Amino acid sequence: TTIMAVEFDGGVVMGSDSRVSAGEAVVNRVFDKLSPLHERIYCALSGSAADAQAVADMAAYQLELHGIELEEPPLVLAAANVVRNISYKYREDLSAHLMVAGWDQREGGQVYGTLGGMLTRQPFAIGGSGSTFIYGYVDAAYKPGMSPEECRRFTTDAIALAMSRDGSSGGVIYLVTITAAGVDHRVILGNELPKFYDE
Amino acid sequence: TTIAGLVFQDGVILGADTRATNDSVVADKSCEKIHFIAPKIYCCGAGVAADAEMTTRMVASKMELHALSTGREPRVATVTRILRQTLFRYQGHVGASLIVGGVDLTGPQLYGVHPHGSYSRLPFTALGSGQDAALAVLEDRFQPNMTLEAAQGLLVEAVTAGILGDLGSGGNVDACVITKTGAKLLRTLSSPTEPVKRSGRYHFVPGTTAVLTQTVKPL
Amino acid sequence: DRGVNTFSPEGRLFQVEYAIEAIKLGSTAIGIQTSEGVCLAVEKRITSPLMEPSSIEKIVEIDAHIGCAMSGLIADAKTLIDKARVETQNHWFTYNETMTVESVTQAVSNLALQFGEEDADPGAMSRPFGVALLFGGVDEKGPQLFHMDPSGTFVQCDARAIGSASEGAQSSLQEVYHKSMTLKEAIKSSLIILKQVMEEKLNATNIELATVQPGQNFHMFTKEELEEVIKDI
Amino acid sequence: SYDRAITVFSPDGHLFQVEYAQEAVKKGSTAVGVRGRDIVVLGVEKKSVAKLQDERTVRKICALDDNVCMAFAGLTADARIVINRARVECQSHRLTVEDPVTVEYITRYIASLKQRYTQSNGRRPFGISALIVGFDFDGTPRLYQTDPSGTYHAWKANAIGRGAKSVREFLEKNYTDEAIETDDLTIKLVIKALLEVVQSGGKNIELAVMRRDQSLKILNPEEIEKYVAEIE
Amino acid sequence: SRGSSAGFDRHITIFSPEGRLYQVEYAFKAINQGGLTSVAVRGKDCAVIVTQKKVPDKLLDSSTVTHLFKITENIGCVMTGMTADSRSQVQRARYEAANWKYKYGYEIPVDMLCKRIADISQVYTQNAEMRPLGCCMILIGIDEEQGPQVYKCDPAGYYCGFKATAAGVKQTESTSFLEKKVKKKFEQTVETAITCLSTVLSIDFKPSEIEVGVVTVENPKFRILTEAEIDAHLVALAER
Amino acid sequence: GYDLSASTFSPDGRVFQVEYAMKAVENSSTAIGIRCKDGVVFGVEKLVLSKLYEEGSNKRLFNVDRHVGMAVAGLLADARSLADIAREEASNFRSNFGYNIPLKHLADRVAMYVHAYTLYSAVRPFGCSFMLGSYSVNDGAQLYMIDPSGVSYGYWGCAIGKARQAAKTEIEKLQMKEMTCRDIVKEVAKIIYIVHDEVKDKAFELELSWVGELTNGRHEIVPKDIREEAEKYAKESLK
Amino acid sequence: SRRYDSRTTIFSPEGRLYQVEYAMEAIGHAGTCLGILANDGVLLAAERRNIHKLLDEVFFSEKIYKLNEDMACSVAGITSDANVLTNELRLIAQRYLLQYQEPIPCEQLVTALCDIKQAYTQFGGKRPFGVSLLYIGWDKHYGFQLYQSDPSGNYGGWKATCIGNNSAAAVSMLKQDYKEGEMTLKSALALAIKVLNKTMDVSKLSAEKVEIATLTRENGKTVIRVLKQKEVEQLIKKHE
Amino acid sequence: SIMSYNGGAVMAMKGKNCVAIAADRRFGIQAQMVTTDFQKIFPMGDRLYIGLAGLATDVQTVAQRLKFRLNLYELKEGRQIKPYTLMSMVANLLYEKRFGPYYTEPVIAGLDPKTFKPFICSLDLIGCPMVTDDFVVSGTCAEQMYGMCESLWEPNMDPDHLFETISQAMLNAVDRDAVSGMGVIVHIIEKDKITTRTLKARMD
Amino acid sequence: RGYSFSLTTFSPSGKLVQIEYALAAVAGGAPSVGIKAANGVVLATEKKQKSILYDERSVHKVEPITKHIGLVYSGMGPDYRVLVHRARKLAQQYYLVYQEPIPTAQLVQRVASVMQEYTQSGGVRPFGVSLLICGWNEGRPYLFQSDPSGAYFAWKATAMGKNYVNGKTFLEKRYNEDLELEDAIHTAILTLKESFEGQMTEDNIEVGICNEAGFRRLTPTEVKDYLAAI
C-alpha cells in the first residue's frame, strides 16, 4: 500500500498503488484506494482496508449532510476535520490512514494528512507501507510550483519506485487530478509504469 | 470450503464445494453454500459456517422487507452495504467471508466482503481455504466478456482445483448462473469423486444385539 | 384542578398552605429550651382504651443527643426520622464526630420542598410532608430547639408549641418562659400548658416526655417518672 | 411512566385519597383480633358464604412467617400485594440477620410501604387495614394495626372492617384479664364479639389461632360452630 | 353527528362521535395561514414546481424568502402553510435522504422519501401530545425507472402520485383548472404551471414575485430558475 | 381558548401560544439592526427601570461567537437561554468542522431549536425574538431575525419589540445597501431616539454594536467615543 | 396536560374504583361463561357471539384457550385484552416450568396473573383490563379446580360459577341445582346445558350458540377436550 | 477440552420411515464415572427426539430452554413442531449465545408430523444446522462413530435392521472410547410406535 | 415526553367509547370486500379517487406482506401504512426465527396484538382501520378481519367500509362454499358494484388474489377484464 497526494496550483493529484495483500499472498491486485467523499474530495485509504472503508463512508455521510445543509460544496478543511475526528475518536480501534485531498472555492487545492488522528496541511503527503521507501526520491525531486503534468508524472514515478521495492505494493497506479473543472480519473497499467534501475 | 465467483457478458456465476469439516473429519457431504438473498442476488458462504448462515439470512430478511418497501428490485450495492456494516459492527469476530453476487439494472456485480468489513468489487474471486487453487486457475484463464458456457466450465475448473488440491473442501461443486432474466441453481454441477459403492455387506441378523431393557409405546 | 407546584395569587405554594393547615389538626406538642438542656412533652390523644399507650410515640430518638418531637401526619414523619438517623450516623462514620443540631435539621429540612410531578426520575415524593417536627438536642453550642414545618424553614426557637391548640399554648410559652429557667421547671411548665390545652383529663399515659442534657443522652420518662412529675399537677 | 400526583392535599389539609381509601376499608369484611396470655386469635367475617364458594382460597388470614400472621379488610387484591411484599421481606430479614422478625419489624415495614404509596407519583393508597398478630422471639403476644394512612399501633384487641365502631365498642366493654385468662374464653371473646355483626353466628366468619412457638392454627369450622352454640 | 363533538375531541387527536380528527382538519385550515398557493406539475421530460413569493416588507432579503428547498442532488421540494414547520420538515427530509444514502447505498427514490415523511406525520396524527406539522410538503424528483415524480404529503399523512397539483389557499381553483387542462391533453409544462397559478390568482405575475424549480430527465439535478429565465417563460406567455 | 397549549389548533388553525408569545415580544422594548455594505449594526432601546441599576445591566447584545452578534428582545431570560443554545451550536460546529460556522446554518439550527418548543403541551414557546449579525470575507454581512414561531428571514433592515412599525418606517428611509458602518451607527442612533416614545417609559440607554471590516469580523461592542458622538448627532437630529 | 388525564387509578368519594366497576359493567355485557367442578372432570360452557353469519370457524373453539399441559381458561368481555391475558398466562406457567421442572398449580398461576391485573388497577394510570377469566386445571396437590378472576384482580375458587350475561340467574340456578361432591361429569354437562338453556334468551338453544370443553384425567395424563357438535346436539336433545 | 468434561456421544440414523436415535449413559466427571442413567435424549413431541451431548449443564439447560420455547410454540400455534422448524429454533437458541456458547452439539431426529418423512440433523456448538440423509453423530467420540456408521449404514433400512446397525455402531464406537459408554440407549421412531431399548455395553 | 395515561377509558356504561368512535370511522371508510374461495381468497377495494390528476398507480391499498399474505383496509390511510410496516416487520422476525412462512392465523394474532396495544397505552388513540388479511398455506385459505379493538374474526366472506351492512347482506345470499376463485372475484366486484356510485374502472377498484402460487395484485388490465361481463 502506497498512496500519495500532491498539491499544485489548480488542484491536486492522488496517486495510489492497486494491490491489497493478505500476508504473503495478495487478495486483490486491482483496488481503487481513492474513494470520493464528495464531488471533489477524495480520500486515499490505507492500513486496515475495512476500517479505512468504514471511515470513508461515515465521513462521506456527514460531509453530505453538512454539504446540503449549507447549500455549498464543503471545504476540504471541513472534510479533514470530520475524518480527523473519526480517526482520532477510535484510534485504538482503527489502523486507518486517510490522506484526504480535494478542492474548494475558498482555498483551492489542499492535501491534509490525517495519520493517527492529526491534521496537517502539506505539499505532498505520502503514506502507506511503501511510503517508507520513497522519502528519498520525493525529497530529491520535489520542487514547489509544479505544473499538473509534472505532478502526475512525478507521483507516477514515486509510486513506481515504491512498487519496485515494496512487497506490500504492486499492480497499477491510479491517478486523479482534482480541479475546478472536475475529477480526471486515470489508470496506469503495469506495462506503462516508468521503468527505473531494475537491478 | 472453497467458493469462487466469476463475471461474464450477461451475468455472474458462483461456485461452491459441498463439504464441511469438523476439525479433522468431513462432517457433511452435501452442504449447500450458494444461499439466497434476493430473487436474483445470491450470496456464497465461506469461513465460519454458522456465521455465514446467520449473517446472510438476516441480510436476506432486510432485503426482502426492503424489496417490498421500495416496490423495486434490490440492488446488490444495498446487500453489500448492509452486510459490511453488520460485519463491521462486530469487529471481525463473525468470521463470515461472504462473496455476494447479483444482477442489477447497472449490470452484473460480484462483490467480495471479508470478515472485518472490507468489500471490494472485482470481476473474479475465490474465498475459502481453496482460494489458492481457485485464484490460480481463475487468474490463468479469465477473460472479460466470456460465454456463459466457457464461464461454467471455467468456474468448474476452478472449484474443481480447490476440490482436488485442498483438504477441507470436497464433495461436489455447485455453480449458480445468474443473468438479467433470472437465477438458475445448477445444483451439483460436477461430481469428480465416484466412490459411492462398496463390496462388503455388513449385516447382523436380528438377535445379535444383546438387549437388556425394553418398552414400546403405541401412538 | 391544578398542580402541586402552583403559586397562588398571594405568592405561596398551594400545597404548603394547605399542608400547614393540615398540621393544625394534629395533637399539640410542646418543648422548651433551657441552658440545662431541652425537654419535650406531647399529648398522645388516646382514642380508645383498647389501644396500647406505649404505641403512640411522638417523641423519638435521632441520635444520642437529638430528640425529635413531631405533630401532624405521623405517617409522613417516618421518612423524616429515618432520613435524620441515616444522616447523623453517616456523619459519624465519615467525620468521626457527633452531628450538630443545625446540621441535622438543615439536612432533614431539605426533604420538605423536594416534591413534584414532572421531574420524577423515581416515583419521588408527590406532596409536601404533612409533618411539623421539633428537633431538640445539645451539641458543642449547647441546648437548642429547632422548629421545622412543611415549608422547609428550620428556625431556632427558645420554646414553641405546635399542633392543634398550639396557639393558646404558645401564648402560655411567651407567658411563662424566661432564659434563666431550670429544666425541671421546664418540665413542670410544659405539662401545665398541655393540661391547659388537652381535651381529655391528663394522666401519665396519654403523654410522653423526653429531655437531652449536656451530659445526659436522650431519654423518655417512663410511667412512674411522669407520675412523679405530675404529682405537682 | 405515569407520574401525576394522585394523592394531594385539599382545602382543609385533608388527603382526600387517604380518606377515600379508609372509606374502602370501612366497607371491608369485618375482622377482629385479641391479644391473650399465650394465644392470639383473629376472626374474619363470613366473608362471602356463597354455597358454591371454595373456603380455602377466600380467607383473609394469611401467614407472613412462622411467628407472624395477619388479617385485613378492603381491597383484597391490594392486601395480597402487601402480604406478598411482607413475606419476601421477612425472608430477606432472615438472610441478613439470622433472627426471625419481631412483629414490630414486619409491621413497621408494611406501614412504611403503605406510607410510600400514599406519597408517590401515580400511585393510589392501599385500601387495606392489616391487623398483624405475632410472637416476638421472647414469646410475648403482638397485635399491630396498620391502616392506609400508614400509622400503626400496638393493640390489646382492635377490630377493623365495616362496623368496626360497634365491634371496637365491644372489645372496649369486654376485654378483661378474666376474658383472656384461658384459650376458650379468648376465642369465645372474639366470636362473641363478631356475633354482634356476623349474620347467623355459628359457621360464617370462621377464625384462626396461633399458640406460643406454634405455627398458625386455623379452623376447624365445626369447632367454630361449637363455640357458636356455646355463645348464641 | 353532522359536526357533533364530545369531550376533548376538539382539543387533541381523538375521534369525535363521528370518527373525524378535528386537529388534522384544523391543520388543513392551518395551511391557509401562510396565505400562499404553490403548484407542481409534471410532463414526460421534467417536473416543475412554481410558487408565489410575497416580499412585502422590502427589507426582507429576497434571497432567503423561498419555499424551494434542495432535498438532495435530485429531489425538489416546495412547502406551504406555516413556515417554521416547513423548515423543520425540510431538515427531517434531508436527514432521511442522507440516511437512506448511507444505509442503502443509493439515492432515495421520491416515493420512499415522501412515504417516509408521511410516516413521520402520521405519528403526530396519532400520539396525543404533539400537534400535526401544519405544512403540506410537495416533492419532485426524477427516478430512472418511472420518470418524473411529484408526490404530495400533508398533515393527514396522505400522499399520492400526481400529474399536477397545488397547495395553499387556492388549492380548489388550482386543481379545478388543472382538471380542465389535463382533460384536454406536456413539453413546456412551466407555461401550464404559471398560466394556472396566475389564473387562479389573476395577478399577471412579475418575474420577481415567484420562483420555479425543474428536474428534467436530461438533467436530474434539481435546479432553480432565476428571475431572468422565469422572465423568459413569462414573456413567452405574454407574446402569443 | 382553545388556546391552553401550543399543541392545539383553533377552529381556524392558529396555534394561539405562538401568537401570544409574539404579543410578548411586542410588549418589550424595540431593538433594530441594519445590514449594510460592510457589516451589521445594532441598537438597543434598553429602558433602564430604575436609577439603581449599573450602567450595563441587562445587556441585550450578546456574543454567540466571535464572528456572530445577537440582539434580542422580549422576555429576556429566554434570550439568555438562546444565548446558551447558540453558543453551544457554534462551539459544536467548530469542534466538528474546524472553522467559524456560517451564520445561515446557525440561524437554521437555532430556528429549529425555537421551533422545537411550539409543538408540545409539555413546553411553551420562547417569548423572544432576536437578530443575528455576522461579517466574513467569504459571505459578507448577514442579518437573520428569528421570532417566537422559529421562522428565519434575512433582512436588510429589521426591528423587533414594541415600536416595530415606526422603526420599520424609519428604516425604509435609508439606502443601507450603500452605507458603511461608521455612518450606519449614527442613523441607527437617530432611529432609536425617534421611535422611543419619550414621555411614556423615559430613561433608556443606547447600547450599540457592529461587526465588519473595521473590527476584522470580530463582533465587539461600539467604542464609547463612537457611541457618544452617535448619540450626540442623533439627539441633534431630533431637535 | 392535566386537563387530559382521566385519572384511572383513584378512589371515588365513596371508595369505589370507577374504572374497575365500569369494566365490571363491560364484562357484565359480555357473553355468559360458566364451568362446573366435579369429581371425574371439569367442563366449561360459554355462549359464543360468533353467532351465526359468514364466519369460518377456523379455530377449534372461541373462548377456551389452552394454558399448559394441565389447564384451560375462559375469558369474557374484551376479546383483545383476553388475548393479552392468555399470552401472559402461558408465559408465566412456562417460566414456572423452566424454573422448577414441574407443571404450575392453578392457584400460583392465577395469583401471578391477578397480581398483574391489580398492578394496572393501582398505578400507571392505564385503564384496567375489562376481562373476567374462569380457569380449570388439575394439579397433584389439590385436584380439579375452578378459579374466577375479574378486572379488579380479585379471584376465588369455586365449584361451579357463571360470569357474563345473566350471571345472576346462572349462579342462582347453580345454587338451586348443584350437589356438592356428588355431581358427575355427565351430571355437570346436563346441569350446564340447563343453566345455559334458561339464561340465554336467544331463544331456542343450538349447538352453534355455545361450546363446551371438558378436562379430566386419563392414564396419569390430563386431557383437555372440546365437545364436538354431535355431542352438543346429543346433550341438548337429551336436555329436551 | 471443555466438551469432553463429561463425555458422551449420541447419534441418529435414517431408515425407511424410521429414524433411530442412540446415546450413551455415562454421566462422569473427567475420570470418575458418577452415574449410569444420565438422560441425553429429550423428547420434543410425539415423534421427535433431540439428542444432545457435551458438558452436562449445557445438555440440561439447552434441553429445558428448548422445551420452554417448544411448549410456547405448540400452545400459541395449533400444531406440533415440524422437524425443520425445531431445527431452526434450536439453531437460533444456540446462536443467541454466539460468544458464550452452550457446549452442546445437538442432533435432532424425528418425523414430519403430517407426512411422516424421516428427518435428522446435527449442529455445532454455535448452531450450524446440517441436515443430512444418512446419519449424524455428536460428542467426545465422534470419530469411531463416523467409522462404524459410514461402514455399516445402507440406503433404505427398515426399523429392525436399523436397530441392528445403530446397535453395533454405538457398541463398537463407545468401547474404543474412555470417556463414554456404560450402557447405550436406543429409540426407534416408526410411524405408529416408538421402541425404547437399552443395550448391554461394557461396564468398565 | 408524551402522555403516559390511556386515552381510552371505560365509559360509565362500560363500552369503550373510543373504539365505538373508531369503528364509526372505519364504517365511513372506502368500501372493501373479501371472499374466500375453495382454492384462494379475493380482495377488492374501492378507490375513493378524487381528481384525474392522481397517479393512481402511485400507491395501492392491497399491499403484500410476504409471498403469501395480503392486506386491505377501510378508513384512515396513513394508519394503514403503520400496520403494513409493522406486519412486514413481524413476518420477517418469524421468518428469521423459525425459517418458515408465517401462518396467517399467527400474523393476524400478532398484528391484532399491535392494534390492541394502542387502545391501552399512554396518550395514543386506537387505530382507525379494519384489516382484511388473506393468506394461504398448508394448502388452505385464510381470511381474517381485525378491528380497532384488536379482535380478529375468521370469515368466509366479508365487507367493510361505507355501507358494510348492505354489503354483508349482499354476501349472505351470494356466497356458496364451493365457489371457485374467479367466480368469487365476480361476486366481490358485484358486491362493491352495488354501492359504488361512480362507474367503476380498472383504475378505481383494486383486486387482490391469494392462492397456492402466492399473493399479488391484479394489474388494471386483468381487473379490466373482470370488469367486463358486468
Swiss-Prot record, chain C:
Tissue specificity: Expressed in fetal brain (at protein level).
Residues carrying sugar: 190
Localization: Cytoplasm; Nucleus
Induction: Up-regulated in colon cancer cell lines. Up-regulated in fetal Down syndrome (DS) brain (at protein level). May be the target of the transcriptional activator NFE2L2.
Annotated InterPro entries: Ntn_hydrolases_N, Proteasome_alpha, Proteasome_alpha-type, Proteasome_alpha_type_5, Proteasome_asu_N, Proteasome_sua/b
Residue numbers of Phosphothreonine PTMs: 47
Name the record gives this protein: Proteasome subunit alpha type-5
UniProt source species: Homo sapiens (Human)
Curated annotation (Swiss-Prot), chain D:
Pfam families reported in the protein's UniProt record: Proteasome, Proteasome_A_N
GO molecular function: identical protein binding
Residues bearing glycans: 129
GO BP term (any one): proteasome-mediated ubiquitin-dependent protein catabolic process
Coiled-coil residue windows: none
SMART domains reported for this sequence: Proteasome_A_N
Induction cue: Down-regulated by the ribozyme Rz3'X. Up-regulated in colorectal cancer tissues.
InterPro entries in alphabetical order: Ntn_hydrolases_N, Proteasome_alpha, Proteasome_alpha-type, Proteasome_asu_N, Proteasome_sua/b
Record-listed N6-acetyllysine modification sites: 226
Keywords, comma-separated and alphabetical: Acetylation, Cytoplasm, Glycoprotein, Host-virus interaction, Nucleus, Phosphoprotein, Proteasome
Compartments, record wording: Cytoplasm; Nucleus
Record carries keyword Aminoacyl-tRNA synthetase: no
GO cellular component annotations of the record: cytoplasm; cytosol; extracellular exosome; nucleoplasm; nucleus; proteasome complex; proteasome core complex; proteasome core complex, alpha-subunit complex
Signal sequence region: none
PTM characteristics: Phosphorylation by ABL1 or ABL2 leads to an inhibition of proteasomal activity and cell cycle transition blocks.
Main location: cytoplasm
Residues the record lists as Phosphotyrosine modifications: 152
UniProt keyword Glycoprotein, yes or no: yes
Sequence similarity: Belongs to the peptidase T1A family.
Protein purpose: Component of the 20S core proteasome complex involved in the proteolytic degradation of most intracellular proteins. This complex plays numerous essential roles within the cell by associating with different regulatory particles. Associated with two 19S regulatory particles, forms the 26S proteasome and thus participates in the ATP-dependent degradation of ubiquitinated proteins.
NCBIfam families: PRK03996.1
Protein name per Swiss-Prot or TrEMBL: Proteasome subunit alpha type-7
Species of origin: Homo sapiens (Human)
Gene name, Swiss-Prot/TrEMBL: PSMA7
From Swiss-Prot, chain E:
N6-acetyllysine modified-residue sites: 101, 103
Listed GO CC annotations: cilium; cytoplasm; cytosol; extracellular exosome; mitochondrion; myofibril; nuclear matrix; nucleoplasm
Cited SMART domains: Proteasome_A_N
Glycosylation sites: 4
Modification type Phosphotyrosine: residues: 158
GO MF term set: endopeptidase activity; NF-kappaB binding; purine ribonucleoside triphosphate binding; RNA binding
Modified residues annotated as Phosphoserine in this record: 16, 62-63
Record localization: Cytoplasm; Nucleus
Domain of life: Eukaryota
Keyword vocabulary terms for this entry: Acetylation, Cytoplasm, Glycoprotein, Nucleus, Phosphoprotein, Proteasome
Main location as per UniProt: cytoplasm
Gene Ontology BP term (one): proteasome-mediated ubiquitin-dependent protein catabolic process
Pfam short name (any one): Proteasome_A_N
Family in the record: Belongs to the peptidase T1A family.
Summary of the function given for this chain in its UniProt record: Component of the 20S core proteasome complex involved in the proteolytic degradation of most intracellular proteins. This complex plays numerous essential roles within the cell by associating with different regulatory particles. Associated with two 19S regulatory particles, forms the 26S proteasome and thus participates in the ATP-dependent degradation of ubiquitinated proteins.
Name recorded for this polypeptide: Proteasome subunit alpha type-6
Species of the source: Homo sapiens
Source taxonomy: Eukaryota, Metazoa, Chordata, Craniata, Vertebrata
Swiss-Prot record, chain G:
Protein name per UniProt: Proteasome subunit alpha type-4
GO cellular component, one term: nucleus
Biological role: Component of the 20S core proteasome complex involved in the proteolytic degradation of most intracellular proteins. This complex plays numerous essential roles within the cell by associating with different regulatory particles. Associated with two 19S regulatory particles, forms the 26S proteasome and thus participates in the ATP-dependent degradation of ubiquitinated proteins.
Modified residues (N6-acetyllysine): 126, 175
Induction line: Down-regulated by antioxidants BO-653 and probucol.
Organism: Homo sapiens (Human)
PANTHER family tied to this protein: PROTEASOME SUBUNIT ALPHA/BETA (PTHR11599)
Swiss-Prot/TrEMBL keywords: Acetylation, Cytoplasm, Host-virus interaction, Nucleus, Phosphoprotein, Proteasome
Biological process (GO), any one: proteasome-mediated ubiquitin-dependent protein catabolic process
A Pfam family reported for this protein in Swiss-Prot or TrEMBL: Proteasome_A_N
InterPro entries: Ntn_hydrolases_N, Proteasome_alpha, Proteasome_alpha-type, Proteasome_asu_N, Proteasome_bsu_CS, Proteasome_sua/b
